[PDB]
């Protein structure tokens, strides 16, 4: 068959550089040009460059013409890129492809993260009802997972009890630091009558903590 | 450079029935041979690119005939008899006629229902939080369809928008809605200096801003 499998996710330290690889296997690497695309967080897809590993000849997309260098193992038939001086703006998946006649083929990808940022558990905030009473018979509360990294965390609602009425946010990576948020749905007769608290943890930090929902003064 | 306009940005189809996605060039892809290049990807949630059609209408490996790609010069579409689950995810458009080659936006399919409001929560920040020197006000505008919403926040009086991150969820398989974190963030300082945070959405189902604010009182 064939395959290209590439390097798992990387951490990279803005300001510095990362190598990632794709090994090429089930055909014959040296025949056919290589690909390289990125994929920013949301974002669509970007085609860096392409190499061939047969007389490393590269051909790059000039936007990343002092960003990317592309490089080939004949005798591990691996292809790799290197990101020089990578800013939070490169933080994304990369991709190695070949898609040519004989076939189009991807990589899983890898993950590369751009942040100076070290472990850091998030600061759990609760997210009470201001004062709108009742508003109708529901109430929803939420939880604010802010400032952690790296990523992810997971949160669940009463041990788990609550799983209905409950949306968990995508995080979103701003400023070196991830910030994500929970909220949950309730009857006024369950809430604040019994106790709502969202559990959080962060495995990066061994981290889990629980924050009581208390009602707003 | 050669741009790639696809559309509709996201698609609503209903399993079962027939689909057509477009996408344009911003100058001709018919090369100097007899080859236009043009090919489809579609990458489902959570895997890489595949390919599914090359050189604007050949399917690949095992690509049922449901998906027929078809196009010249600057306009291309692809349509799919009958959407299946299988078939949900980004499709993406891409060009190797003109360099470097360039991608659409993607387009996303998502299945189609009923049209619902919003339910909206505004949070005050948390006084955990204020002690630490910051302040966030947290919005929660869930299980509303159609995914089109438009939310501004509006402090006592006017919009504003330094420190506000949102945050989108997928559309939740078991409703097909959506739902949408909204998160103001300021200084404590910045917080104290005002007294009205209003939370504004306008949604197709209501021909009024839907609001929910609350002062600091």
């Known amino acids: 068959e064939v395959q290209l499998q590439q390097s798992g996710a990387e951490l990279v330290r803005p300001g510095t550089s990362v190598k990632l690889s794709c090994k090429a296997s089930?055909?014959?690497?040296?025949?056919?040009?290589m690909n390289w695309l990125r994929q920013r967080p949301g974002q669509g897809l970007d085609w860096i460059g392409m190499?061939?590993?047969?007389?490393?000849?590269?051909r790059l997309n000039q936007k990343f013409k002092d960003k990317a260098t592309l490089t080939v193992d004949r005798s591990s038939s691996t292809a790799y890129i290197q990101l020089s001086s990578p800013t939070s703006e490169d933080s994304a998946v990369y991709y190695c492809?070949?898609?040519?006649?004989?076939?189009?083929?991807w990589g899983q990808g890898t993950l590369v993260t751009v942040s100076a940022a070290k472990t850091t558990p998030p600061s759990v905030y609760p997210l009470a009802p201001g004062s709108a009473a009742q508003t109708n018979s529901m109430v929803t509360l939420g939880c604010l997972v802010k400032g952690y990294f790296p990523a992810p965390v997971t949160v669940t609602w009463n041990s788990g009890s609550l799983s209905s009425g409950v949306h968990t946010f995508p995080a979103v990576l701003q400023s070196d630091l991830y910030t994500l948020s929970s909220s949950v749905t309730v009857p006024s007769s369950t809430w604040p009558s019994e106790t709502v608290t969202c559990n959080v943890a962060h495995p990066a930090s061994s981290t889990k903590v629980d924050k009581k929902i208390v009602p707003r003064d | 450079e050669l741009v790639m306009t696809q559309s509709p940005l996201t698609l609503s189809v209903t399993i079962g029935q027939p689909a057509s996605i477009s996408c344009k060039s911003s100058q001709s892809l018919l090369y100097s041979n007899g080859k236009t290049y043009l090919n489809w990807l579609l990458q489902r949630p959570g895997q890489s690119p595949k390919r599914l059609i090359y050189?604007?209408?050949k399917l690949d490996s095992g690509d049922p005939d449901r998906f027929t790609g078809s196009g010249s010069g600057t306009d291309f579409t692809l349509k799919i008899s009958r959407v299946e689950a299988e078939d949900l995810g980004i499709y993406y458009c891409v060009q190797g006629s003109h360099f470097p080659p360039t991608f659409g936006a993607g387009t996303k399919l998502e299945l189609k229902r009923a049209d619902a409001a919003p339910t909206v929560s505004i949070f005050p920040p948390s006084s955990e939080q204020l002690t630490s020197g910051g302040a966030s006000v947290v919005c929660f505008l869930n299980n509303f369809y159609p995914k089109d919403i438009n939310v501004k926040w509006k402090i006592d009086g006017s919009e504003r928008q330094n420190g506000v991150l949102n945050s989108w969820t997928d559309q939740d398989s078991k409703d097909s809605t959506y739902s949408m974190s909204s998160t103001l963030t300021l200084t404590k300082d910045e917080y104290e200096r005002h007294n009205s945070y209003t939370c504004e959405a306008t949604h197709k189902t209501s021909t009024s801003p839907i609001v929910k604010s609350f002062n600091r009182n």
């Open positions: 089930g055909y014959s690497f040296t025949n056919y040009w």
């Open positions: 492809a070949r898609d040519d006649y004989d076939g189009a083929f």
């Open positions: 050189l604007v209408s």
């Open positions: 190499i061939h590993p047969s007389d490393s000849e590269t």
